[PDB]
Each structure stands twice: as C-alpha cells, then as structure tokens.
C-alpha cells in the first residue's frame, strides 16, 4: 500500500539538486541585499535609522530557512526506509552530521526570530546583521556536505543496484 510513492536515487538526486541551487541562490540574496544596507539612508532619522526594509530582510532570511528545512526534510525522508545491518557508521557519520544540522538548524531559528521582533524597544543593530550573515552562510555550507553523505550511503536510502 503506502498512499505514497517511493523515491528514487535519481529524483533524490535531482529534487536534491534543486535546494542545493535555491540554498546557494537564496544566501547569494541576503549579501546583495546586504549591499543595500551600505548606509543608514538620509540625514537623520530618529534612534534607529534603519526599520522600514526590515520587511525585505524578513522575507529574505525566511526564505533562505525556508529552503533549508527542504534539506532537513528531503534528507529525512532519504535517511527513512534506511537498514542495513550490514552497514551501519554510515548512519552514524549521517545522523551525527544530520542532527547536528537539526540542533544548529533550530538554534538560528530563535536568533532570528529575535531579529524579527524584540520584547525591547530596540530589535538589534547592523552588527549583530554581521554575525546573521555569518551565521546564514554556516548553514548551506553544510547543507552541501551533507548531500555527500547522502552520496556515500544513498544507494541504503534508496537501493541503486549494482550492474
């Protein structure tokens, strides 16, 4: 039964191949748009001067996240229906590289759910900006490590035969 169909190396491969290229385009968005925030903009502007484009920074690092948790799903779903009692470091070295990814998935999250909104008057400055950006481009270096894990024991997570 299984209303749902099974997945194939080669769609893995290939519906994987399209996060590896949305992750890299979406990061590439929240540098050029880093580039905008070369300056305040205008003369004076009350205490934080920068606020009204927040909403395209919003939408920008959502959208980076929102490819990322595909690679935490499309990885998951790869990692399910995986046995093998013959082999089994793979699933370590995966797991342990996978669930790292999940805890440090998770843990820019709050943090950037905290650039989103503050209980304080303030939400935060262009230098913590500093640290997102560098923190934004930690989490798709990974993802395309990750995808070589995926590699090296696809043929579990899936079957490829050998000919």
């Keep these: 039964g299984s209303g749902r169909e099974p997945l194939e190396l080669e769609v893995a491969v290939e519906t994987l191949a399209r996060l590896q290229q949305g992750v890299s385009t ?3 968005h929240l540098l ?3 580039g905008s925030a070369s300056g305040p903009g205008g003369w004076r502007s009350t205490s934080e001067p920068q606020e009204p484009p927040v909403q395209d920074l919003k939408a920008a690092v959502a959208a980076v996240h929102g490819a990322v948790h595909e690679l935490l799903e499309f990885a998951r779903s790869a990692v399910s229906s995986a046995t093998h009692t013959s082999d089994r470091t793979l699933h370590a070295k995966l797991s ?3 669930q790292k990814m999940e805890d440090v998935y998770q843990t820019l999250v709050v943090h950037g759910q905290v650039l989103d909104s503050g209980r304080g008057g303030p939400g935060f400055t262009l230098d913590d900006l500093d640290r997102l ?8 270096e990974d993802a395309k490590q990750l995808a070589s894990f995926l590699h090296g024991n696809a ?9």
């Design 155 to 163: 043929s579990l997570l899936f079957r490829r035969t050998k000919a």
């Design 32 to 34: 050029d748009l880093v």
């Design 26 to 28: 979406t990061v590439a």
């Design 133 to 140: 950006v560098a923190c934004s481009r930690a989490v798709p």
């Design 96 to 98: 342990r590289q996978l």
